[PDB]
Amino acid sequence: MNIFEMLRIDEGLRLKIYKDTEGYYTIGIGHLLTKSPSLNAAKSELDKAIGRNCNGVITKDEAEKLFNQDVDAAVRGILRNAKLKPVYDSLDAVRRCALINMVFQMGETGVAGFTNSLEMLQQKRWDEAAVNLAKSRWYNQTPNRAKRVITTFRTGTWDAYKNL
């Protein structure tokens, strides 16, 4: 299992603009287009993103290209961030995927605000960090996905995804 399969599981694939759990306009594999309420603002961002007139629709290939770019940007963002980089460097390969997943979802800025959990992670206090991470709007709003990630950090294995 790898970052791409993990994220494909968590986010799904949609080839028509859709609204995410927060109501924002998204397409493909969790690619946020705009936080704006306008389907029209969304459609324009989409065309910009793809380089064609899509009329709100894209192919699987386009979805995949967007996904590649996004995972790439997620990783680079962590590596450039002073708060995240050290955590990332301290982790094993599987737990590294869990942090990439969080950043893909909530952006660098948001994960960076999980100060305390980040500390526990760096310290390798698995159990404590899992408990602390559950105390978030994140866990309350997307509990099953948050549970999957948390289990991933807790255990260092892909068990939470082996099912799915």
Residues 6+ apart with CB under 8 A from 162: 1
Question: Is there a binding annotation on residue 117?
Answer: yes
Interstrand relation of 14-19 and 31-34 (parallel, antiparallel or unpaired): unpaired
Question: Is there a binding annotation on residue 7?
Answer: no
Residues 6+ apart with CB under 8 A from 72: none
Q: What's the rounded Cα separation, in Å, for the pair 49 and 117?
A: 34
Tell me if 93 sits within 8 A of 1, measured CB to CB. no
CATH of the domain at 29: 1.10.530.40
Catalytic member of 20, 47, 64, 119: 20
Technique that determined the structure = X-ray
Buried b (16+ CB within 10 A) or exposed e, 112-148: bebeebbebbeeeeeeebbebbeeeebbeebeebbeb
Catalytic member of 10, 11, 45, 70: 11
Using alpha carbons, select from 72, 70, 75, 62 the residue that is nearest to residue 30.
70
- The tally of domains found in the chain comes to 1
Tell me if 13 sits within 8 A of 61, measured CB to CB. no
Using alpha carbons, select from 63, 152, 36 the residue that is nearest to residue 101.
152
Q: What's the rounded Cα separation, in Å, for the pair 79 and 160?
A: 26
Question: Is there a binding annotation on residue 104?
Answer: yes
Residue 28, phi then psi, degrees to nearest 5: 65, -125
Residues 6+ apart with CB under 8 A from 143: none
Amino acid at 126: W
Question: Is there a binding annotation on residue 15?
Answer: no
Residue 151, phi then psi, degrees to nearest 5: -60, -40
Q: How many CB atoms lie within 10 A of CB 6?
A: 23
Q: Which domain holds residue 63?
A: 1-164
Structure tokens given for 152: 């991933």
Using alpha carbons, select from 38, 47, 109 the residue that is nearest to residue 78.
109
Resolution (A): 1.7
What is the 3-class SS of 82-103, one letter each residue? CCCHHHHHHCCHHHHHHHHHHH
Residue 54, SS3? coil
- Tell me, yes or no, if 20 is annotated catalytic: yes
Q: What's the rounded Cα separation, in Å, for the pair 151 and 50?
A: 35
DSSP class of residue 53 equals -
Tell me if 6 sits within 8 A of 15, measured CB to CB. no
Q: List strands edge to edge, sheet with 14-19.
A: 14-19, 25-28, 31-34
- For residue 26, the cross-strand partners are 18, 32
Give me the count of residues in the chain: 164
- Break the chain down into helix, strand, coil percent, rounded to 5: 65, 10, 25
Residue 139 CA neighbour count, 13 Å, CB half: 13
Tell me if 142 sits within 8 A of 21, measured CB to CB. yes
